[PDB]
Design a protein around this nucleic acid. Sequence first.
RNA 1: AGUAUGAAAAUGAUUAUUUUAUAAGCAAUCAUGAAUAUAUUAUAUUAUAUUAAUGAUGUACCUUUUGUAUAAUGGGUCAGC
RNA 2: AUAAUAAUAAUAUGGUAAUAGAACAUUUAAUGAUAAUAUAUAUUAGUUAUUAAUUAAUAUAUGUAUUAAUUAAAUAGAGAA
Lengths: 154, 324, 138, 119, 177
Amino acid sequence: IEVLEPSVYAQSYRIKSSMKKATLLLRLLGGLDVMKAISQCHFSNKKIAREVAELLQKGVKDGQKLGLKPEDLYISQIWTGSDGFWRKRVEFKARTRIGIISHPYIHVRCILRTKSVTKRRLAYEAHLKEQKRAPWVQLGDKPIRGVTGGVYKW
Amino acid sequence: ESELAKYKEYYQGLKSTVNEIPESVASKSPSLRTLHKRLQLPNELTYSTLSRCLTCPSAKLPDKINNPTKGAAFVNTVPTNKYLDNHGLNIMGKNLLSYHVTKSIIQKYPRLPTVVLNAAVNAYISEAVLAHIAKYWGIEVETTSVLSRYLKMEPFEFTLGRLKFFNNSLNSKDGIELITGKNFSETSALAMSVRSIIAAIWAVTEQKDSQAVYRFIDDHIMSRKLDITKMFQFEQPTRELAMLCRREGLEKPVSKLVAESGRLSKSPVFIVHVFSGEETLGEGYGSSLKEAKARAATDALMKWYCYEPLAQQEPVIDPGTVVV
Amino acid sequence: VVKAIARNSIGRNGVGAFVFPCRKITLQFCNWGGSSEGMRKFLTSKRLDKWGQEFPWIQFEVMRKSGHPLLRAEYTNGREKVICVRNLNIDNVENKLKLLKDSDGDILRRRTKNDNVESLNSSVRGIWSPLHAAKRHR
Amino acid sequence: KTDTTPLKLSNELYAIFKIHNRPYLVTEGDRVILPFKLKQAEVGDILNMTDVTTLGSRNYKLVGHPINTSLYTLKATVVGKTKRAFQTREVTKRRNRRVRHAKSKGDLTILRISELSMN
Amino acid sequence: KQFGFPKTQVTTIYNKTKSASNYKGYLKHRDAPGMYYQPSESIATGSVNSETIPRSFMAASDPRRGLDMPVQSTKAKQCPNVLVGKSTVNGKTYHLGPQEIDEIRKLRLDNPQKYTRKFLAAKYGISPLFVSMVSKPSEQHVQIMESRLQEIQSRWKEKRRIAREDRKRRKLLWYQA
RNA sequence: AGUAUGAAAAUGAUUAUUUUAUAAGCAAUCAUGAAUAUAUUAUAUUAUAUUAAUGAUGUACCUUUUGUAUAAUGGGUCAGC
RNA sequence: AUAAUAAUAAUAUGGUAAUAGAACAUUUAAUGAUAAUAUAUAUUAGUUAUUAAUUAAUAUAUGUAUUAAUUAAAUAGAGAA
Ligand SMILES: [Mg+2]
Ligand SMILES: [Mg+2]
Ligand SMILES: [Mg+2]
Ligand SMILES: [Mg+2]
Ligand SMILES: [Mg+2]
Ligand SMILES: [Mg+2]
Ligand SMILES: [Mg+2]
Ligand SMILES: [Mg+2]
Ligand SMILES: [Mg+2]
Ligand SMILES: [Mg+2]
Ligand SMILES: [Mg+2]
Ligand SMILES: [Mg+2]
Ligand SMILES: [Mg+2]
Ligand SMILES: [Mg+2]
Ligand SMILES: [Mg+2]
Ligand SMILES: [Mg+2]
Ligand SMILES: [Mg+2]
């Protein structure tokens, strides 16, 4: 039921940053509507923001091409990973000390779902759980924990 | 030789055996013999009748066989003779089961309400409980295709010892469940096998041991656990209790307080008794005075409705459900 | 008024008629492989006939497969117990047959201390109530 | 001399019976798990309790050491003989590489109470 | 006293005050053989047991009727009334004929706001429940009250709502017994 | 430093279930509520699986030593050798 | 006069350095049917007194085991340098 719901898979390119630096921005764009997460990336001061904004626009266009409506889309899962093949270089310090400098390259991948299907389903499920939950009985039938022991104490 | 001809002979032979159900081949089925005396069926119950219990009225193939593209295929069943079938047995089984359970519940709980009794009778002989009983006993549903049995060269005795009815192969495949009638449901087929067994155990032993099938029913059906207390749900117990007290000679009921603790607290305790005079009819607790009064009224009603007389008492006939 | 809460009865095997837990035993083997020499000699011996006569509410199979020997036991509840009988002699295969036969099909479990009685019935004497106590506390 | 009518006239009854001096408190159709393998009793055989210590109802009791076997009828049926779950524990010392395993798989005997009534 | 059995109680060789839950004490207690009257230290709200059914509730030809099991420990003379109505403490009264009843109905349909249950109850010396029995308000009065109720229920936040449904399930549990 | 495949682990982000903002120590074992998920014999008053309610017990591993939690030596982790 | 299994009575079954007996995993060599309704590997849930092998489901490769079993050999088992 999760996979069959409408979704758009947006992948970035090999961008020069670190997976820590990107996470600072991506944690903001958690469940935000794409049509507004784009504006936030536009006005962010982080270099990573510009490329994330372009990715969201492509996803919105991608969803618009599959049949979905741009105002119906919202980021459901945004994350990042190591692109691989990081170049390692040796840092030369003063008194014969050596360091290794790595140059991380990462990619940011998004998943956008439709708020007219996924969110409604989740809201429906939450309602069922609320109904299914048991009441609170002040003198509740709390189980008598402990093995009886072959003796009738009452 | 053309192998199609060999299948012709196998198919005709299987159809003939089902149409006749001879005892010579029915007695060669290990499933039948084991199923026979696992339940201690009388020695006078021929293994052919056991097969007849398992057989079902699969007379003519339906119009859904035409295409399985619509989610329905019936290849595991062979047409059966109309005379040899469980169609008449399950009616007897249903009649016996309904009568005994209703009679036995009433005898144990005379004052039961009609609606509660119908629920209790349903619980004992529901379609689900009977289906579960059949599976417990080991009755198997023939799921392999008739062709498949030919290649494997299965003797007819095995197929003759299984539950045979129109089976919707491709039922739950890929999640597409085509909805059919009760005639194409494994649950219904199994239940009527149990009813059919109840009928046969009667017909054979009705002449010499009248109270035999009923003993069998009390061994397997009414030996099951059921708490009548959990089948009740009152709405206005106070008014209904007052009507009961007026109807009988009992005095007008008044609910009074016995003990309390933590009145000004989150979870107090109140004990109230419904006094029909000096005597108390019901005991009730709760975290509120209103809750205790309701609990006490329900207890008194439950005690009246669930009274169980001793087996040595003269039979007691309830004056009927209270009408408000 | 009175409404009914529908329920279903609970199977209590033994109180009325006792239905034996095991329903079917399968004796699989292989015609090639030293792992099944014990099962072969068991099937050729006169012991399997004795087991059929003594326990005729159990259905016995013998099957040939290109693999290890086995012993499948289907029980009433629905589960199945399978035993590998590689490199075992006649008496050990018989003993494993004895274990499968005389066992309910229940999944093996861990039991606490003194947890020995499981009843689905209510209490003859009701749960202890501080208000309705033998002697009041203090 | 031993009055029993109050226990005759009861909708439910309970018994405290001992097998090898281990007390078990049971009712009609209760299940007992004896923590040993009964070699003398075969699966499906019916036992007859004859060491019942206490028999009682909601407000009454009958205690004996043991109660006379003619005053009641308690029978239990063997339903199955199974084993506990497999547990293995390592037994080792503080600075010892060698570790020994103490495998445990207990034997149980399932019993179901068939009849329990006064006589 | 139908039976003269010695009276006992759940006893432990230890101190019950500090060792109530110690099962060994009850294991190691031995009582002399015979019969014992050991009362149950519990309530009987949902107990069908034959030893808690009231005497008046069993058949006339019941042997257990003579036996005094359901002891009348509590006396009515000292237990105060709980949520009892005025018509219960003071006997029911039947003093209205058709003429007054028609007046009650006509008065209510005329102007329910001024002529309410309490007003009619005080005027004719009858209970508000009775006015429900005989009188029926105008459909407009019910419709505005129902709409008024819905408005009250609308302003609730999530917590109140959940609490109210919680109350509803508790009621079912009370009556289920 | 051949070519294909690659749900091997360490490691990173996100999501899902459960627990967590009045409680203190080798992070586990046992006792025991509650929530959640699966189950084509849950007939259920059902069985498993995950989860830091709460209670009891619990001084990492190896080497060397009469003797180590020792604040005595060796170990960031995983894979191959 | 033996071997396997099961009964009854009795005795014993902590263990460093060390001694003695018996087994399991991986690879190679000799003999060695079967086969996509099978075989190998991995995950999950069961079975067998369980470092192992098995049942079922799922996923990927292969028209396919140096496969079961008896011997003969080891670059034959890693939290410890
Ligand atoms: Mg790569
Ligand atoms: Mg520098
Ligand atoms: Mg670095
Ligand atoms: Mg040492
Ligand atoms: Mg160690
Ligand atoms: Mg103490
Ligand atoms: Mg807190
Ligand atoms: Mg801390
Ligand atoms: Mg030193
Ligand atoms: Mg120390
Ligand atoms: Mg250190
Ligand atoms: Mg330190
Ligand atoms: Mg170090
Ligand atoms: Mg030793
Ligand atoms: Mg090596
Ligand atoms: Mg390693
Ligand atoms: Mg190790």
